[model samples]
Target: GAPWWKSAVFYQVYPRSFKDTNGDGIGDFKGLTEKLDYLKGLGIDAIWINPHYASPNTDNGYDISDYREVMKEYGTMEDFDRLMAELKKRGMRLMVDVVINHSSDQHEWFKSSRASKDNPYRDYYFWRDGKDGHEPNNYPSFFGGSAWEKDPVTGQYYLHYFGRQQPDLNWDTPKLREELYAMLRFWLDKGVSGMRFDTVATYSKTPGFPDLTPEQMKNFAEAYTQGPNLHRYLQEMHEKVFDHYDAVTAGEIFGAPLNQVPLFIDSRRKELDMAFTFDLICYDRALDRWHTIPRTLADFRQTIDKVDAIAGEYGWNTFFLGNHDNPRAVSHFGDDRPQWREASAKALATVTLTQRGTPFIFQGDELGMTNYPFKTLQDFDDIEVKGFFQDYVETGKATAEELLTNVALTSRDNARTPFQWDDSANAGFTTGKPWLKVNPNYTEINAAREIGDPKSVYSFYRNLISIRHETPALSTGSYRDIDPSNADVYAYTRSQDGETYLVVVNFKAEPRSFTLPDGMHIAETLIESSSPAAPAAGAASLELQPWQSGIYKVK
Candidate 1:
């Protein structure tokens, strides 16, 4: 059978903030099941939920304690079974997050390994003797400080590329590799059709615990992600687990070059189906998340063009603006201000759905969710933020005021806020207090208020997805720039066989006029931002309003 994911639209659900069925103020499987109908109505074909595996919540479920069990906070295995059944009933697929780069230090494997140096499970994780009374290497943890954490019981240092509570697994061990395959099968056995591999590039490591230079330490993840055995490992996984099941996989291949994408996703590679790229988000990042460079249209178009160019010749591309690990799409990439919010949201959606790839819609994105307004540092709940605060502010690397100001603009918590289901208390996300604060503007921007409105962001997304589903050119056509010189207007054409579609998006806060390429004329206006009508036919130019977007059949 052909891959269903190739033509499907995915919506990512950050489980903790999606909805709270119980009074505990945290989202669970039951809550997700409850919302399946709403998601179906939104025109999404599949749901990709963040990790819901048993965890210690150190990295918000990224640190898994058990692979086969559901998180206690999330619910029991019965709840997960019901959710799976419900999705199947609606002809929808489910993709669970699979985090193998690390495990919670509380995991039985980690605990057993730390108990004694001679234990069989000792080789399951990396354990090396300290060098000169210090850590073995100069590799810095993604969270902060040394990547090696000393174990009190064994008096040996273990590698943890992220927070100290998360110990990196040793994929080099044959026994450990077998166990990982078994764990993967355990989920695939449950009928889950896809898996989003977390931090997928770091499964293998560079040989020898070598010390990284200061410059290398600054971008140490690059070295970690492009490990020598990374491909061999992926190919092996594909042979053992992926090939046997009708499953699709997308790796979180950050820190790797765009050119390397083909190595993982090209059909002949037998590695992965696709990968999520961070180049778009990282384009504006400067010294760190704290200091961001302003975005420019030239850079934005060039970045996407580069990616699309590779995808056209190599493998498929992925269209996503933001996720749980980043800020909201409307706030980060679009104008989230009161005057332009809805239009901008629709404009971005039009581009995402009409583009040449499998588009992903982050939860709350269809409703035009914006970033949260944090008043103080204490309001944050992300471990990454807290760890960075201690490493930067407490250590005098940065002032608290300096860090807070930037964090407000770039913190991961901005996307982790409770979903704004309605104007009710806690935005109707929970019956009790939420694990995180609800954005203050939820009253004005929520799913309940916009789901039925013809001009609302939610309805716009539904229409765009429907059009994408029915238009072969939109999904499997050749992509070419319509007017590459116009920086303010992102206009592109998707053509297949004799069918061609023109997509125009005004990525700005002011009006812009764009002329079609030579001999190109509009035959019909399939969809537009403000109205459904077209100005006669055969128009060679367009006067696009602020945050306007349209898709047209052209000749």
Candidate 2:
């Protein structure tokens, strides 16, 4: 039998901005529990929430201070237990975020590791001696400056792939592996259905504190990702923890080598259930802070086609257009202006739900939420964006205006704004001020209004989810893009046994015509964005409206 995740559509909840029960201006377990009925009503089968673990929040909740305890800001352990029970009662599963790639500097293990050179915990993280009275190497952190941080206490430098406060774990250490596995079991034993593993590829670091060459330094992630012990560590994790339970894993393999992806997800390997593909989000940028290349519909189709072809051959794929770390999908890939936003949102939803992979929809996405208009650095709360100001503007690598333009377009903060629940004060997210400002356009775009309208973006997404749930071919069928060369439209087909579905999307602002291939014709119009009239049965071609999408039964 196929795993539950294969057919499930998961919703990712960013805890801080989901909803706030207390006046602290932050979302918590209680707030999430309050929203279970809403999710269940939306037809979501499972939820993959961002970290709610204890953290100093240097990088939001990516930096974990304790593996077993809940963050006090998110409420007590009892609150989490109650939330779990509510989800189970609704027959929906929970998948938690696990950040074993690194831990907060405030974590007990890191505190002890730096206490003394001989501390037993010293080996839990990478701590190396300085060379020639300076840092060990010139490796760059994902957030900013040098990846190595010099510790005053031990007079050694520790490696950090991201912010300095997040020191990389020494997966080379056997005891550390055992400890992480135990922590995973603690959650799985408590009924967690799966996990979203953060920075899964970089768990194993390149040995010997090697210096990156000038070219390697230009793209440090490429040099460090898919390290020597990556597969060994995952296999061990599976053998010890995951294999014992019917659990699913979503590995954040952002920069994975295409050929090696099968090693992580192929069923025979027993490592991960599925791995995330990053080419869509990473398109037109290479970690540059000042500029971006304009994207076209052909570019988008090519990216998705590449991944679908690979996954079709090797293992299962995970499909998503946005997450906690990226900008809103509608704003980035679709038209976010008033006249086209709803249609554009529905088009993207069609692509994600009908594509050949498991789908994940981020919070507020179903309501067609677009990115917030951020004008100043003070408007942002992400630590990553703040680091860019220090590294690029203050150092004169780029002008403040140049960096601001790019940040507005690509910063993770664009997706961190509070969810828009209603048109009331603070978009009905809370009575107190939100931790992050609500998008000003929330009055026009929100969940409450969309849920009531039959043709709203949220309602369209609901109908699409229902159709996918009832159609086995949509989940397990083979994918074929009939017109891969069309720069204005993305047309594809999914077929299995005797069932076939054709999906056509007009990704541009202007209407486009898509000609059905000679042998196939529309048998029935299953769904349409903005209620565009479907073509008559046996029609040879159809002209699609601006930013429109539709699915049809084909003959």
Candidate 3:
């Protein structure tokens, strides 16, 4: 199988917010097809399209109704095929979001399962008799409420980690696993280059569901488990479905410990090409409050350091700062200044792209987009935020006004705003009202204005990605952190074969200095986020202006 991801740069496209044709107030595949040239010109090599499968818009299409059909809201299956053909023509590969952990209640399988206890599809889902006329398990749903929902007709309970409308599939049955593998093969045969498996870790739960202990109740692990046989199942799926197609498979796994990561990525195992980890993304947010807890530079450095140390033995690692589900990195760390924002954005790109693994870039991230400030609760649409507000605020665990304020500023809706393509009305996202409001800052941050400007953040990102591709050491190098004690400065060395490079960034707004260790001689400034000045030879010490970032080769 080909290692396609090693040389690929993935651009995530949220279909509903990407672009809209027919003035329908929502993005469609036809619109995305028209924008392929724009994406290809930006040097994108791979595209990861979020679920365009048939859905009811509950949980933003995470609740899938039909796995085989494209949603009418996005476009027809013919439109999807056209987009694929266009992407291939541009030398770019496409990966669809594979959501198989659960299915929408509207799905035929679920409808049949809930019809009666004797239905043939009842065993295809996770169904159990209620204990003493109530839910059998104590598990709680991710969207607030019991994880088990009773079927009025059958008098049986079905499991759901998310909303009641999404019933968990019974992966314990071999027939169901075969069915899933068949669906995967169907897409692979259709020319899909890969799949971003959604919520994969929770597919197989504990046979005897156990209640969470007092301490474990607050931990996410208590709600889901990556079953002991998950590796075996993944390996089988890879050999039977993915390996034959030479396709990339990225698992959206959660609640797994660091040590277990190698089992998934080890060359011998062949279970998964890469998996998304969240240690760095979860920093600063309080567990109970889920609000910005105000982080110091020290906290940021420590989080990256921990991930680096844990994945040191592994040959590759996944790196990302923002995605559709998280708040924008610039808004979270950039302090609202153009220079600082651009510098920080480039610094983050340098750190992630030069790491041990392939980097994934979310939509609009290359243009230095920030999170939008939603004005009111009515403006928010994410299910997670709504659930949190109802469960935490209405229940009086926190004040309603405070939770509402946090939702407006920090919800996933901030990242889901319409993509800013130009400075025109609707930011060129759509001709009519966008499904979500365009970021007001789109006037200055749109792509049309940035692509031609040499000093723009968009151009900086292009250079950063191009350098990673052109330099062998930057792509497949060993990583080592420099001055681990320096809280404000993030510095690392990347070495491959006999060549080495040093990357340094001052993540704060104040000047900082660092001394080079012995035997490391600077060659020249290869790239700088802001200025083109080179460091003086034998200077023995270096001083960096606020948010200064640079890359250099070692002689």
Candidate 4:
């Protein structure tokens, strides 16, 4: 009940793709400060800024080189302070990225740690002599090769769950733990209202790094994810830093066990305010860039059912399908076929908004933004995709055409493209050239094109959030699956106190009928993505048009 993130609607801003202000064509803190009015009026409670810390661009900014300073391209510390002050003045809140699971290998601390095995900071990082004269362990990196990268100098291997440039911090070290806590406190004391922990679950590693076969490596995630001491570290973090501030905290908990989630975020446990599970995203996650499968509506039903079921009396959930690391929401779950784009976009918004948890809006998603027009590998900029390509394509494990097609459909770089600001040159994202590609759909799907139109996807999203905030039942209600086996429709109800709201969305571009549940009476129509057959007294069912999304007050 004390968590601000519970009812909050978080607007995730991936800085580079948000807006460019300087002639250099990179998004900066000034651009954000100037763009404050947009987010303020966008019906969002807080801004969840992606990494803006100094980095080697290893994984964009996730490989933080300096936690104490802002990235030079973004702006100065003064600019960050100005932006923070400006946001607070406007009645908005700020949540900065706190990525301590690992630090850039280029960081001074890491530099010192790797200089020599005898270096005082050597213990700051994981340094182990290779086991049996081979690589340390069998774990594979999320992005590339073995999670263990051999240090040519020390003849030892260090753990990096991501890129080799991002060496995992030895949280087992007391000094490192204290330093990270200080870094977190530094930002909160500077007036930030929240912190989004990047890869927080990997802070603890399974004891005795072990071996795995290729087949075993396929499911080796649990070995490093949510290790034995994660809760202990999180609780320690809570007492050392969080207890001093009212700031809400959310962790990028990759390997969160559904049953144990409450121990981490229960109101009494105090480990976190809320956390997101990749359960929904993993439903359709590609086996490889060249191989993929789509999740059915039944998959959606099962995932949400498990999620809401475990959210017990204490556990809190964060609802989101796409983010900086994920592809655009439109392309992920909706039919991007031109005619159905707007409808599906609105329908996705309805589903997320009505879910009984905090919701996040990745940049450009509010305007029905889709994926990139990637034709070749050159169109990619993300390190993860490049590594995948190298391992699967360049090495002849997969074909160029196949990988390229996969990149176009699901690569993280698709979401990294510059924001489509207007139909003007470069989607009005920059005065000159941009650092990466821009989605060519800017001409038809720019903010300039959608903001003013009442029926626009952006407008529909705004109204959706507005209604969610207006109706407590939609934001904090208990969730129930209305018809669990319906493969063509996703329907659910939210009830709180005496208020009841039912949400139904047509997942396909065809007309469908939804039979009303017994003992339920429609009291009012709240919002609909498109016109549907109006509910009548004693009617058993209502017809929904193509991609229709509707909400009704029920009694």
Misplaced by over 4 Å in model 2 are 213-215, 395-399
Error of 3 at 423 (Å): 1.0
lDDT of each: 0.87, 0.87, 0.79, 0.82
Number of colliding residue pairs in model 1: 0
The residue-level lDDT of candidate 2 at 204 comes to 88
Better of 2 and 3 by TM-score: 2
User: What TM-score goes with each of the models?
Assistant: 0.96, 0.95, 0.94, 0.94
Query: What TM-score would candidate 3 get against the native?
Result: 0.94
Q: In model 1, which range of ten residues has the least summed lDDT?
A: 527-536
Clashing pairs in 4: none
- Candidate 1: where is the Cα deviation over 4 Å? 213-215, 391-402
Alpha-carbon deviation at 49 in model 3, angstroms: 1.2
**Residue-wise lDDT of candidate 1 within 383-415, one digit each (tens)?**
667867877999999988888788887888888
lDDT score for residue 454 of model 1: 84
Least well predicted 10-residue stretch by lDDT in candidate 3: 308-317
lDDT of 3: 0.79
C-alpha RMSD for every candidate:
1.9, 1.9, 2.2, 2.2
Model 1 earns a TM-score of: 0.96
